[PDB]
């Protein structure tokens, strides 16, 4: 057999295995995944409805929050679920076909599928209720989403390689994911921020990607200075190259 169908079979097998173990019981985890964003939308709308109403008179809060939140849930899942993909399946690396990166890409594919299904269902629900649901620039939105997905997968693979023997490193990055949820402009629009803190926030690629996705989604959405795609694209490419090189170096050290 060619060395490519082996990869396809292994990836399908690991995807099925991980989908089986992720959904506890008779698929109880899908309810949890569905109840995170509605709970988030409820609390944040109840808190800052008037705040967004005073922010800008062109966008309603649910759609702004959902297109700022679902991509961030995508990224957070691609970061968190990917470091544990190596140690949890450590016993599977004895069948002559399973390699450490196969489990990583299987977890990435499952996260992509689950969060994309959630995004489509939630967008359909928002359109059904009566809210805006059609992006004005779908191709640019797809490109930004692909860039964000690549950056998240690259960061997950890099962390899985680096912190293989250091669970405390996984713990501290899990801690620090939470401030990234507040400094990425997911909740509140970012143009209501004093300019002195603007350049310091220009170093966050996730903020750039969120702003560009919102621009490609909403019509006539104003984008402030330094929200170019070149910086997050280069960040994702460099991170992917570094992660692949590190995995190639520390390849035989995974049992």
């Amino acid at each position: 057999r060619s060395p490519w169908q082996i990869q396809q079979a292994v990836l399908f097998a690991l995807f099925l295995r991980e989908l089986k173990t992720r959904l506890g019981g008779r698929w109880l985890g899908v309810f949890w995944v569905l109840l995170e964003p509605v709970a988030h939308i409820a609390v944040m709308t109840t808190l800052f409805s008037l705040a967004h109403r005073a922010a800008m008179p062109s966008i309603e809060y649910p759609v702004f929050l959902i297109t700022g939140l679902i991509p961030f849930f995508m990224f957070r899942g691609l970061v968190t679920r990917l470091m544990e993909a190596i140690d949890s399946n450590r016993g599977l690396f004895a069948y002559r076909q399973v390699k450490p990166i196969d489990t990583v890409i299987a977890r990435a594919m499952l996260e992509i599928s689950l969060q994309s299904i959630v995004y489509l269902i939630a967008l359909g629900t928002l359109g059904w209720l009566g809210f805006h649901f059609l992006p004005v620039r779908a191709l640019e939105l797809a490109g930004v989403s692909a860039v964000l997905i690549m950056l998240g997968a690259s960061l997950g693979l890099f962390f899985a390689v680096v912190t293989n023997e250091i669970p405390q490193a996984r713990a501290i990055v899990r801690i620090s994911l939470l401030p990234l949820y507040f400094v990425s402009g997911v909740i509140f629009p970012v143009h209501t921020i004093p300019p002195q803190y603007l350049p310091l926030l220009q170093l966050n690629p996730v903020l750039h990607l969120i702003e560009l996705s919102r621009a490609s989604f909403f019509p006539q959405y104003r984008v402030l200075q330094g929200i170019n795609l070149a910086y997050p694209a280069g960040f994702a490419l460099l991170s992917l190259f570094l992660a692949l090189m590190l995995y190639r170096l520390r390849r035989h050290q995974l049992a």
Partner: protein
């Protein structure tokens, strides 16, 4: 589990990719109709502010203005001419509400808060008709503002950009929409194929 076995892969990608792209390509390259767009940029200032422009924005998408324009330029007759297009053609015998929704879809009004300038983009099936409808909208808007000022008991409409005559259609964008639908269909087919494989494996 027998039904999904018949679904296999070939039939799945034929029913989820091939048919939608063929139908969309046929409609876009055969039956789709051109829609020329004329753009104007106006604002209202007192001869001697933002609220009056907002009233104009509300008034443009109203029913009285639509009745005036239908009496003047006969929009209902014009919008039914492209019989080749089934989607973006105003069918005969439609209701008042459907006519209002269609007119609101054709005419797009946009605002920015920083500059306070109101931009109107009017679609049509002829560049001359689109420009004429934009000019009529501007004239009726300035007349409404003046009549409101008169009946309140001295205002003028500033035209930063007068209505232009378009040269080619811009909105029935065929290749961009085809690429978007290709991406959407590919993602949908991948997700559906993965899910159907999972349920086929789980059922038996």
């Amino acid at each position: 589990m027998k039904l999904v076995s018949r679904l296999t892969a070939k039939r799945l990608q034929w029913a989820l990719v091939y048919l939608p792209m063929l139908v969309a390509t046929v409609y876009f390259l055969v039956f789709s109709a051109d829609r020329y767009v004329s753009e104007s940029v106006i604002t209202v200032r007192q001869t001697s502010s933002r609220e009056d422009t907002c009233y104009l924005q509300t008034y443009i998408h109203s029913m009285g203005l639509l009745q005036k324009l239908d009496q003047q330029l006969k929009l209902r007759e014009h919008f039914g001419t492209p019989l080749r297009d089934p989607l973006f053609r105003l069918w005969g015998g439609t209701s008042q509400e459907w006519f209002l929704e269609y007119y609101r879809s054709r005419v797009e009004v946009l605002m920015d808060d920083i500059c306070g300038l109101l931009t109107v983009r009017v679609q049509g099936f002829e560049p001359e008709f689109a420009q004429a409808l934009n000019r009529a909208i501007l004239e009726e808007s300035e007349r409404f503002v003046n009549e409101l000022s008169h009946r309140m008991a001295l205002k003028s409409l500033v035209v930063v950009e007068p209505p232009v005559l378009p040269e080619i259609a811009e909105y029935p964008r065929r290749w961009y929409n085809l690429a978007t639908l290709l991406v959407v269909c590919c993602l949908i087919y991948g997700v559906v194929s993965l899910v159907v494989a999972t349920i086929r494996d789980h059922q038996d």
